[PDB]
Amino acid sequence: NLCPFGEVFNATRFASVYAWNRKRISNCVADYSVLYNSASFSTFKCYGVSPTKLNDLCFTNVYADSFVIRGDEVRQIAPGQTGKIADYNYKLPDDFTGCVIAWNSNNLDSKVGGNYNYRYRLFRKSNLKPFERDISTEIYQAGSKPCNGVEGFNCYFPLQSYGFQPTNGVGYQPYRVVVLSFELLHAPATVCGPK
Amino acid sequence: EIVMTQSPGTLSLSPGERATLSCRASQSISSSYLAWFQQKPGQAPRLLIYGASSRAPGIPDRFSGSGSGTDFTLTISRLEPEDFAVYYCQQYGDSPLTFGGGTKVDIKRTVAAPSVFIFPPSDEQLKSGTASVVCLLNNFYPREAKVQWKVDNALQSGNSQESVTEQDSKDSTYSLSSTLTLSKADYEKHKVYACEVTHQGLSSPVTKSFNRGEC
Amino acid sequence: DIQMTQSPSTLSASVGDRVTITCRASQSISSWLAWYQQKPGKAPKLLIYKASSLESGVPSRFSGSGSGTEFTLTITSLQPDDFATYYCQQYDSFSWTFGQGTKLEIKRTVAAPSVFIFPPSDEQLKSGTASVVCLLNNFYPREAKVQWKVDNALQSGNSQESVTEQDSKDSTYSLSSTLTLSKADYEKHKVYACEVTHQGLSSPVTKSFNRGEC
Amino acid sequence: EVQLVQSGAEVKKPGESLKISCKGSGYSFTSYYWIGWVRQMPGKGLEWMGIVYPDDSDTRYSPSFQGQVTISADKSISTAYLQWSSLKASDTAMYYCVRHPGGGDWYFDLWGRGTLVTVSSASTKGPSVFPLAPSSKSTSGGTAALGCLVKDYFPEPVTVSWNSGALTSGVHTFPAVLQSSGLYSLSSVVTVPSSSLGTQTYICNVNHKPSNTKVDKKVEPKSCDKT
Amino acid sequence: EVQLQQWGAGLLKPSETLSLTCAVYGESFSGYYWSWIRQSPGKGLEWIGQINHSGNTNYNPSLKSRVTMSVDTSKNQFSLKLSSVTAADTAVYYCARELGHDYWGQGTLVTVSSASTKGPSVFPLAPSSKSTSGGTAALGCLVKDYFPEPVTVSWNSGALTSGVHTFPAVLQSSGLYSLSSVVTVPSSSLGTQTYICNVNHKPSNTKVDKKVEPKSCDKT
Q: Mapping DSSP to helix (H, G, I), strand (E, B) and coil, where does residue E94 land?
């Protein structure tokens, strides 16, 4: 069947880390050989499994979460972490089973002048729960007055844009990230490797 | 960590005149998220300008903001006694917050001739097991003035510590005090001790000195 | 490959009138679509991106509309500098595909297609082959056919036609067919006839000449 | 001014290889922009070929052209290159170099004037001039036509003027159509009053630059000598 | 008008632990983040972190490893613990509200050092025949090798408030402090009026009342 690991990795446009795109994969023959053997993926980590023995398992469902972030905020994509991305935008659990992949995309996501289309959530009155989204654009009240959906003093907008230019540094450059989460339940296994 | 840099590190004006301070970031900032803080001695910082152009409540109409991207500027129409303080630029568009170094604002007046004085040690400190000579410059503007020590017509370094006073509330002048400390052995083998001074208010450096056992 | 379909393809109009063109995608391209203008000989020019945005250096009569699967381009105050070809391009996904083209014309009265016939010269025969020609000077609209009859008998695959562009004065086309043959096949028969058919013409006129007769 | 300059036209033959260039001037041209190529067949639409990033020398092609052509770049002199190994007759077309304002804005904001590529089996040749003196049925209310015909010439283009460039009364030079012998044919014609049996001595001036050929040929109402 | 009250340790020693506590009055403790901000000389202001009522923390990567924040909701209190304090952590710490644009604390100075309490050595600098410029000569006293701050100096027990210039405390290599207090007076009084430099160190309650006399060149 060779399910679509190309519409996820090889796509022209990606999402913003506060609106990360999730795709469900089911009833497939999954080839994890292109990934484990490829000089493109700068970051390739795997938690709960060994990356050389992936074609030997059989899960029930797979979830592919895709987004774009800075180059220095990739260490925040892991269990038991802290930061602006791991508390307000995208949070992984602690009993995590899957694999994190990340690669540079300065040629597609950058632009002379600046690409201000990728955004992050900067302000939140609490911390996200694992695998939770928050697309609300309500106004952040940090003072004594109510904001009434109107910006002003100590009433700020929580979604703020990255600044991506080609002449930036490797730490302020864009990186595209795909998180694969395997789900093995009491039901049969519909995602097995090839033979 | 967005690095903010203020310009200039110091500034000297007089009442009435207008003031212009600047802040510059390392990478472009979010929409215009750039605040200006004021700080006086003893007190805590006070916010004046938010959003790089908006004026917070209870602030006089003479503080104005401008700029965007990587360059921002604060303007003060007419300086007042309460306006001489230390200013800071802050960015809250990313995480973590980052303040700027600072930019002081000192009063300006006419140059003044530093009154130079020297002091010899006391036998108490001598028998105590050390010696230290003192040079005092008084009532001089501006602050930038150089001082050095010469033991028996021989420059020194690393063995002298200087301190400066604060702008008086009356005449806008400064005082400097340099202490040259050393073991009594170096004081009994070196002969002379000379305080040399160079200030913009003078035409040529001036040296005041005294020799061993002189008084 | 997202396939783009334009409509119409040949759309006549006048000066000062309002014109509309449509592009259509096989999928959903939210707002990723640009419009290019191309005149004969010159390179294409950008007019609109994002499907509702204008380029710096463009007039206001050009406007774009749409989102999803159908887009439109409208030109209100048409002027001579707008008669050209227009292409829609999508830039949502690779590969990037254009449309097919939507030309513009300059309508006019239904002209009166004339017709001329010119035989060959014996110098062409000395060269080894002869060629007759038939012209339809100053005709409109463009649809006009010329049939060649060698002895009142259709003869295809032997001639070649060529049609001009729109004249700048009367906006009329001009066509010319040339029937080339050998010094042997030229002796095949004698009556070479050119028959002009044109919707604007009420009766197809015919003009024929025998070998060595004119 | 911000612009892109392309190499001149090209005439070639099958089998041979080819390389054409585009250079950008007026911006950070040395790098940081995708340079691509767009094809246009004679009297047809536009087809996209590929793009290249000069800095990292990345490349993206279209399926219809993957393998056939090569698209490369050079950041030092800021020049992009399109390359063929074995040419065919189908590669006869106009080619434009284009620039992306990247970062999600993947439209073409800059175009070149276009490089014309002709792929022929034949070789250079001079034109053959023939007359198109008026006809008998051409006595259409006085509307008499005359002309000249330029046939069996290669490569393009030629130019056909009249009276050393003094007559433009309803005079047309039809396009050049391609025969099967790898040659070209066209005709120029003028309309006048049928009273022009002796009013004008029209001379067609045909000029072909590649072959350095020039021919001035007169027109005369053909007189069928009576026996 | 939110009011914030700080307290905590002052002097410490290397590799010890610093603990501070700020309390709130006049508004809801919940619904906001509460931040800590330190200011040092030469290194300007700096942001440490912020804590919520639910116990959720934002930290600065520079200090992520050493900082521990705590919150007591019942008392409306939050607290900071910074470990492995070196001599570079000497600074003034403030407690503030989220994005301190609105309200701040009053400040808590924290000093690190290896030495302990100690009293000052007072030595007089006397008006010599060389240091007189226009019938007005300068004298003074010099405090050396004291710890900690502040040691306050007066003259004739507040009987003089003119020409008084007291310089700050310069840190020496011995981890101690030193300063000098000079005063200018007319040479027409150095033999008539009494000149004393009353020094008082509070952290040790050590007081001195030393009189000053000229530096004559006794001819043997």
A: strand
Q: In the numeric block, which tokens belong to residue C192?
A: 């070479």
Q: How is the beta sheet containing C85-90 ordered, strand by strand?
A: C53-54, C45-49, C33-38, C85-90
Single-letter residue type at D47:
E
C93 CB neighbours in chain A (<8 A) are: 11-13
DSSP B123-155: HHHHHHH-EEEEEEEEEESSS-EEEEEESSS-B
Label each residue of C100-166 as H, E or C.
CCEEECCCCCCCCCCCEEECCCHHHHHHCEEEEEEECCCECCCCEEEEEEECCCECCCCEEEEECCC
Answer with the one of D62, D87, D119 that is the final residue of a domain.
Answer: D119
The domain spanning residue A112 has which CATH number? Answer: 3.30.70.1840
Structure resolution, Å: 3.0
Q: Phi then psi for A108, rounded to 5 degrees?
A: -100, -35
Separation CA C161–CA C179 (nearest Å) = 9
DSSP annotation string for D194-220: GGGGTT---EEEEEETTTTEEEEEE--
CA distances from B32 to A156, A157, B35, D220 (A): 11, 12, 9, 82
As a whole number of angstroms, the distance between CA E162 and CA B140 comes to 17
Question: Across-strand partners of B149?
Answer: B195
Question: What are the structural domains, with CATH classification, of chain C?
Answer: 4-106 (2.60.40.10), 116-209 (2.60.40.10)
User: Between chains, do E99 and A154 touch, taking CB under 8 Å as contact?
Assistant: yes
Coil vs helix vs strand at E57 = strand
CB-CB contact of B4 with B12 (8 Å): no
> Experimental technique used?
cryo-EM
Q: Are B128 and B121 in contact (CB under 8 A)?
A: no
Return the residue in B177, B197, B206 with the most chain E beta carbons within 10 A, the one to mutate for interface testing: B177
Q: How far is CA E186 from CA C4, E165, E189, in A?
A: 99, 16, 6
The reply to whether A13 touches chain C by the CB within 8 Å rule is yes
